Design a protein around this ligand. Sequence first.
Ligand SMILES: CCCCCCCCCCCCCC(=O)OC[C@H](COP(=O)(O)OCC[N+](C)(C)C)OC(=O)CCCCCCCCCCCCC
Ligand SMILES: CCCCCCCCCCCCCC(=O)OC[C@H](COP(=O)(O)OCC[N+](C)(C)C)OC(=O)CCCCCCCCCCCCC
Ligand SMILES: CCCCCCCCCCCCCC(=O)OC[C@H](COP(=O)(O)OCC[N+](C)(C)C)OC(=O)CCCCCCCCCCCCC
Ligand SMILES: CCCCCCCCCCCCCC(=O)OC[C@H](COP(=O)(O)OCC[N+](C)(C)C)OC(=O)CCCCCCCCCCCCC
Ligand SMILES: CCCCCCCCCCCCCC(=O)OC[C@H](COP(=O)(O)OCC[N+](C)(C)C)OC(=O)CCCCCCCCCCCCC
Ligand SMILES: CCCCCCCCCCCCCC(=O)OC[C@H](COP(=O)(O)OCC[N+](C)(C)C)OC(=O)CCCCCCCCCCCCC
Ligand SMILES: CCCCCCCCCCCCCC(=O)OC[C@H](COP(=O)(O)OCC[N+](C)(C)C)OC(=O)CCCCCCCCCCCCC
Ligand SMILES: CCCCCCCCCCCCCC(=O)OC[C@H](COP(=O)(O)OCC[N+](C)(C)C)OC(=O)CCCCCCCCCCCCC
Ligand SMILES: CCCCCCCCCCCCCC(=O)OC[C@H](COP(=O)(O)OCC[N+](C)(C)C)OC(=O)CCCCCCCCCCCCC
Ligand SMILES: CCCCCCCCCCCCCC(=O)OC[C@H](COP(=O)(O)OCC[N+](C)(C)C)OC(=O)CCCCCCCCCCCCC
Ligand SMILES: CCCCCCCCCCCCCC(=O)OC[C@H](COP(=O)(O)OCC[N+](C)(C)C)OC(=O)CCCCCCCCCCCCC
Ligand SMILES: CCCCCCCCCCCCCC(=O)OC[C@H](COP(=O)(O)OCC[N+](C)(C)C)OC(=O)CCCCCCCCCCCCC
Ligand SMILES: CCCCCCCCCCCCCC(=O)OC[C@H](COP(=O)(O)OCC[N+](C)(C)C)OC(=O)CCCCCCCCCCCCC
Ligand SMILES: [Ca+2]
Ligand SMILES: [Ca+2]
Ligand SMILES: [Zn+2]
Ligand SMILES: [Zn+2]
Length: 248
Amino acid sequence: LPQEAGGMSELQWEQAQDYLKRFYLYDSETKNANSLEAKLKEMQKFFGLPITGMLNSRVIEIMQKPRCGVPDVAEYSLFPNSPKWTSKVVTYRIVSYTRDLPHITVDRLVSKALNMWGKEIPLHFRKVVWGTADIMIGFARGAHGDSYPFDGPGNTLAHAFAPGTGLGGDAHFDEDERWTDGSSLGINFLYAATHALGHSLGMGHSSDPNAVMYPTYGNGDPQNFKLSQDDIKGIQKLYGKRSNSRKK
Ligand SMILES: CCCCCCCCCCCCCC(=O)OC[C@H](COP(=O)(O)OCC[N+](C)(C)C)OC(=O)CCCCCCCCCCCCC
Ligand SMILES: CCCCCCCCCCCCCC(=O)OC[C@H](COP(=O)(O)OCC[N+](C)(C)C)OC(=O)CCCCCCCCCCCCC
Ligand SMILES: CCCCCCCCCCCCCC(=O)OC[C@H](COP(=O)(O)OCC[N+](C)(C)C)OC(=O)CCCCCCCCCCCCC
Ligand SMILES: CCCCCCCCCCCCCC(=O)OC[C@H](COP(=O)(O)OCC[N+](C)(C)C)OC(=O)CCCCCCCCCCCCC
Ligand SMILES: CCCCCCCCCCCCCC(=O)OC[C@H](COP(=O)(O)OCC[N+](C)(C)C)OC(=O)CCCCCCCCCCCCC
Ligand SMILES: CCCCCCCCCCCCCC(=O)OC[C@H](COP(=O)(O)OCC[N+](C)(C)C)OC(=O)CCCCCCCCCCCCC
Ligand SMILES: CCCCCCCCCCCCCC(=O)OC[C@H](COP(=O)(O)OCC[N+](C)(C)C)OC(=O)CCCCCCCCCCCCC
Ligand SMILES: CCCCCCCCCCCCCC(=O)OC[C@H](COP(=O)(O)OCC[N+](C)(C)C)OC(=O)CCCCCCCCCCCCC
Ligand SMILES: CCCCCCCCCCCCCC(=O)OC[C@H](COP(=O)(O)OCC[N+](C)(C)C)OC(=O)CCCCCCCCCCCCC
Ligand SMILES: CCCCCCCCCCCCCC(=O)OC[C@H](COP(=O)(O)OCC[N+](C)(C)C)OC(=O)CCCCCCCCCCCCC
Ligand SMILES: CCCCCCCCCCCCCC(=O)OC[C@H](COP(=O)(O)OCC[N+](C)(C)C)OC(=O)CCCCCCCCCCCCC
Ligand SMILES: CCCCCCCCCCCCCC(=O)OC[C@H](COP(=O)(O)OCC[N+](C)(C)C)OC(=O)CCCCCCCCCCCCC
Ligand SMILES: CCCCCCCCCCCCCC(=O)OC[C@H](COP(=O)(O)OCC[N+](C)(C)C)OC(=O)CCCCCCCCCCCCC
Ligand SMILES: [Ca+2]
Ligand SMILES: [Ca+2]
Ligand SMILES: [Zn+2]
Ligand SMILES: [Zn+2]
């Protein structure tokens, strides 16, 4: 089947390699080319490729895989400590939206993704449409001012600030990415949106392959979505009641 990374110039691989560093600000194991190449061989194994040390655009696909291009550690304007909201009530506002698709495809899917987190965790989410809110969600073109290289269609699709009392909590989706609703020839917004919002709620990734924000995240709509309740158990301590026989 056709894809873009098989028709783009060889330059893509060093770009995609350079990209890997920014996921943590720095990564010590992605620094030195000896280690770059050792850790890219480890990427192929983690994803399940039949050749560790393949040179094929399939390997670019695992490097550019739908996720953000930002420090996914406490950083991207944050002190060292796990972020969480200081309440169980949070608001949100769709400040902006896409022209290739009507408003619904945002407003109903951010809400639905927040509903995914907020049925399990007793988090209340209120929609603001005029006024101040906690989570300012916008769709933007990437000339508007964030660190790192700009981005259009291709690698990187949102950034998200973790729970903050002003400037934090908030996301900018990529309006130059082609998101779908009914058409299927885009990135599934609801899918992507979930971990974008998971950022806005202050969670991390999980080693459990039943987890949603497991890094081998994709573009198209899941068949077999599930949560690790094992991860969420320590989120339930932060917003939920203490109700053990020994601790209540
Ligand atoms: C008979 C004449 C009719 C003319 C109709 C023109 C269209 C009227 C309806 C649409 C207005 C469009 C406004 C516009 O595109 O703003 C462009 C930018 C806005 O920043 P931008 O990111 O585009 O939009 C941000 C807000 N967002 C994300 C929430 C949508 O903001 C700018 O780039 C700066 C805007 C500076 C305007 C200065 C004052 C202009 C006065 C014109 C008065 C003419 C009187 C005849
Ligand atoms: C007092 C007299 C009556 C007054 C009427 C009401 C006036 C209301 C003014 C509204 C100002 C709102 C502020 C603002 O940010 O407006 C932004 C708008 C809509 O934003 P939005 O709907 O978010 O789209 C954002 C821009 N986009 C597509 C690049 C992603 O951006 C636009 O809508 C862009 C407008 C582009 C117009 C370009 C020229 C079109 C030509 C029309 C004629 C064509 C003749 C062949
Ligand atoms: C010599 C003096 C005059 C010189 C005038 C020259 C041109 C001045 C233009 C200034 C603004 C240029 C910016 C521009 O073209 O905005 C375009 C807008 C919105 O673009 P937008 O949807 O933001 O993104 C466009 C994506 N694209 C190009 C791939 C389709 O596109 C439009 O909004 C067109 C969409 C259809 C509008 C329908 C208009 C029907 C007539 C309505 C009459 C209403 C009562 C007045
Ligand atoms: C830099 C400036 C360049 C020059 C600008 C020249 C004048 C431009 C006037 C505004 C053009 C408005 C175009 C317009 O969208 O007409 C149709 C709309 C909605 O049609 P719809 O298919 O929703 O939107 C099509 C356009 N799209 C894809 C670009 C969003 O119909 C509606 O949205 C319903 C509106 C009903 C209420 C109207 C109340 C205001 C009356 C006076 C408006 C005077 C406008 C100057
Ligand atoms: C009675 C016969 C009528 C004949 C045609 C008249 C054309 C007048 C404008 C009609 C515009 C239709 C309304 C509209 O806003 O269309 C915008 C389109 C593209 O919007 P876009 O969202 O790509 O459509 C995507 C649709 N989707 C999501 C389902 C894939 O398109 C654009 O954004 C650009 C549209 C450019 C229009 C240029 C009009 C210049 C007219 C001749 C002017 C001569 C001046 C001397
Ligand atoms: C002084 C400046 C002047 C500048 C221009 C001002 C005047 C502008 C006129 C603007 C009107 C444009 C309307 C237009 O583009 O309609 C397109 C339609 C399809 O619209 P459609 O895709 O349903 O709109 C979807 C929009 N969405 C996604 C937001 C829901 O297209 C159709 O559905 C076509 C249907 C044809 C049906 C059959 C008609 C038979 C006609 C036979 C006539 C006699 C033949 C001898
Ligand atoms: C006395 C005859 C006057 C005849 C011309 C009157 C002109 C009226 C201009 C109104 C300008 C509004 C500009 C703008 O949209 O401001 C938005 C604000 C708040 O927006 P926002 O907070 O989103 O509104 C939320 C509440 N909502 C949806 C239910 C409206 O909305 C507001 O805060 C409303 C602001 C109203 C201001 C009216 C100022 C009048 C000074 C008149 C001085 C004497 C003139 C001879
Ligand atoms: C004599 C009676 C007046 C008595 C005054 C008594 C004192 C009242 C003080 C009122 C204080 C509230 C002021 C105010 O903000 O009222 C807003 C309303 C509703 O605005 P709303 O739509 O809720 O918010 C809209 C957007 N916004 C905030 C950005 C401006 O504004 C509206 O409801 C007006 C809506 C006008 C839309 C008209 C568009 C169609 C015009 C014709 C178009 C023809 C096309 C062929
Ligand atoms: C007649 C000789 C020439 C004939 C050919 C004309 C060809 C015109 C070519 C148009 C080229 C642009 C096409 C286009 O799709 O533009 C869409 C834009 C959005 O671009 P987009 O990348 O979304 O945002 C760009 C932002 N910018 C301007 C800060 C870099 O939409 C805009 O940025 C919205 C425009 C908003 C301007 C603010 C209007 C304020 C009110 C002014 C009222 C003026 C009355 C005199
Ligand atoms: C009824 C009145 C309608 C007019 C109303 C007033 C509207 C005034 C708004 C002017 C908007 C200017 C915005 C602007 O400069 O943005 C840059 C755009 C497109 O940039 P773009 O191609 O996207 O590349 C820039 C962004 N990049 C590298 C990140 C991809 O554009 C450009 O790069 C090219 C700008 C070309 C201007 C050409 C003017 C030539 C005629 C001027 C008049 C001469 C006779 C007096
Ligand atoms: C003679 C007529 C007098 C007209 C006087 C109008 C006074 C209007 C006050 C507008 C105040 C806007 C204040 C403000 O900064 O709002 C912020 C938002 C978004 O801010 P921000 O997210 O930084 O936008 C980032 C995107 N960037 C940097 C790439 C452009 O962006 C905005 O909300 C967009 C504001 C666009 C408003 C354009 C005003 C002219 C529209 C046409 C009205 C025509 C009437 C016939
Ligand atoms: C009489 C009372 C008037 C009071 C009006 C109040 C206006 C408040 C506007 C707030 C607009 C908020 C959104 C805005 O910042 O858009 C910025 C855009 C592009 O952002 P960016 O591309 O990031 O450039 C940022 C830096 N800047 C502003 C120095 C160029 O910046 C640009 O694209 C520059 C836009 C330049 C103006 C184009 C419209 C001129 C209108 C011509 C009207 C002729 C009437 C006969
Ligand atoms: C007759 C001889 C003199 C006239 C010479 C005219 C030369 C015109 C150069 C016009 C600009 C060309 C570059 C251009 O298309 O920039 C595009 C952007 C955005 O297009 P748009 O689809 O929003 O881009 C969205 C993102 N995308 C690409 C991923 C789909 O658009 C923007 O960012 C906004 C651009 C504002 C342009 C203001 C000038 C419009 C033309 C005015 C001509 C008036 C002549 C009197
Ligand atoms: Ca992108
Ligand atoms: Ca905020
Ligand atoms: Zn993450
Ligand atoms: Zn930003």
